[PDB]
Amino acid sequence: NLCPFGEVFNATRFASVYAWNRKRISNCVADYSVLYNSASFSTFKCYGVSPTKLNDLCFTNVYADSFVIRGDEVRQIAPGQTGKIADYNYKLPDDFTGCVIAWNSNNLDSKVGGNYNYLYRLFRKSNLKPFERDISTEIYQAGSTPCNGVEGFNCYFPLQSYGFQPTNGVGYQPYRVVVLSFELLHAPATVCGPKKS
Amino acid sequence: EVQLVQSGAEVKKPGSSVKVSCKASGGTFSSFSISWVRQAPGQGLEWMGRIIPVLGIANYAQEVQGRVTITADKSTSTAYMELSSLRSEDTAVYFCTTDRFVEPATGPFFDYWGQGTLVTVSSASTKGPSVFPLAPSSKSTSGGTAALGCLVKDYFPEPVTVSWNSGALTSGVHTFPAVLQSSGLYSLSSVVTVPSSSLGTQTYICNVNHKPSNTKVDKKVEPKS
Amino acid sequence: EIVMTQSPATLSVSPGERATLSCRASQSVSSNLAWYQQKPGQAPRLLIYGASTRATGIPARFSGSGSGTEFTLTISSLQSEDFAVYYCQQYSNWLTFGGGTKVEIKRTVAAPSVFIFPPSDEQLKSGTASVVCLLNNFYPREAKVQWKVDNALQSGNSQESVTEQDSKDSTYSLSSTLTLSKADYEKHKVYACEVTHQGLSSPVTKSFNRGEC
Ligand SMILES: *[C@@H]1O[C@H](CO)[C@@H](O)[C@H](O)[C@H]1NC(C)=O
């Protein structure tokens, strides 16, 4: 049985980055050559694993995380990076074992006058731990005065919209991201390439 | 681009509630959020709240929290503002706006506005006016010109219209804004300056129409003797 | 909080002239400053955002400048439609509205013509007396009306209302109504309206005696 990579890569709609999606993959045969030999992806960088060995490796579980960001932020989806997306939305671990796949989606995720479905967290008083997902909407207290849950001066709503317009520069255009995580536990590996089946 | 059409004006009693609609004629609002801004008569603009339709979350200002509910039906491209426990202080015009944000500034500015919805709150009941004359005399002349008019008193709600001689007389006419009396009823006057050399020649009739009570009065104003 | 101060409250400029409106922020808002125009009876509309960027469809005779705490809205050649209220608004740290500047039509000074009207016998029959003082076709807008009943200054029992600037001659007119019960109206004789206006070298009084006409 193959792995349902099409559900993740070829999904109709993607999640906002602050509420990034995660799909568990197990008990299937994966064909990573379909992905590395695609040229549809502008970004395909692996960490802690080498890409050409993937078809000959097994793992206990593979997690695919999917979300949308803008072009200038694709570089933040890497270990050790900082910035608004890596600090407040989606953080990779320093010891990351997996791959980061991205591609431009300006045609799917833009609307004339702005597509506002895709949001990001702009304010947070602490950085995320790796793979932490914060979907709360508390008012962010920028000063010393309690905000009482009321938006206002020094009391920011923490989320903001990308507002993807098809006329934005490539840096401000939507990019779909899929992060694969290769997890190897003391348990029978169930996700293998075609060669290790 | 975006056209915002709001529901019509409302006259409401204290303690009751009102719900004002705002429809984006384009089939979409094309904004991150939609705000409601109110303006009391003669006053400035006060932000009340916004709804973020994508999240279904509404943030309200402190002055109305607990009394106000802002919603948005994505299917009909319509935002609603429901104000309850209405007091007379809520008498104002209410505007809906599409919000625009420029990172990293945290405030919105409003690039498109509905036409506004007047909400009058009063314990008064619908009453027609009484029309009394403001008759010309000698202390009512200033050279060759005299002044006369009509006093339209004790009506509710707004408005009344006033014309002179069934629209034939228009120059020199001043119909003043109504004043709200401590009784809760409205009162205005409409005056016109004419040559005093024709106060016996010309006949002057003010035509008063108060549509809310189906009251129409034609008042002849003749000089005093 | 950020406090927005607009000056002056009323800007009297003649048609076709240059208009300059000031907006001051109590602390820096960078360029996150918006200007709105509110024509009489209409909703506000956006003129400028980003301190100097015209909203779509706004003609080039409107322009904004400034950054930080000091902003200005300039109208290069005043048009009749441009006579309106103008609001600035910061959106740097949430939002704050300015108090508004009224751009008013500057015209030559014109003294009011004053008229007083005793209550009608019809109204007196009902039990109430209304005494009306009319100030007709004056400019500037500042005018002071004083009611005296037998030299007793009336305070708190009168209401006034003022027209907008006349579309033809740009003047104002004002109406002042003094309210008395019928019984109090008949206890007194001299009903006077004293009007103070810049176009008058001396204050003017119009008055009648109850029952004498
Ligand atoms: C996505 O769809 C394209 C064309 O429909 C197909 O060639 C590709 O293999 C699909 N990708 C995945 C991961 O299923």
XYZ file of C-alpha atoms in Angstrom, chain A residues 110-116 164-166, chain B residues 1 28 30:
13
model
C -4.547 34.504 -4.337
C -7.790 36.348 -5.000
C -8.317 39.724 -6.631
C -8.662 42.242 -3.825
C -6.977 39.841 -1.398
C -7.333 36.299 -0.076
C -7.569 36.732 3.692
C -2.663 37.401 -0.920
C -3.150 39.517 -4.056
C -2.002 38.034 -7.394
C -14.709 48.732 -5.773
C -17.434 39.907 -0.997
C -12.327 41.783 0.407
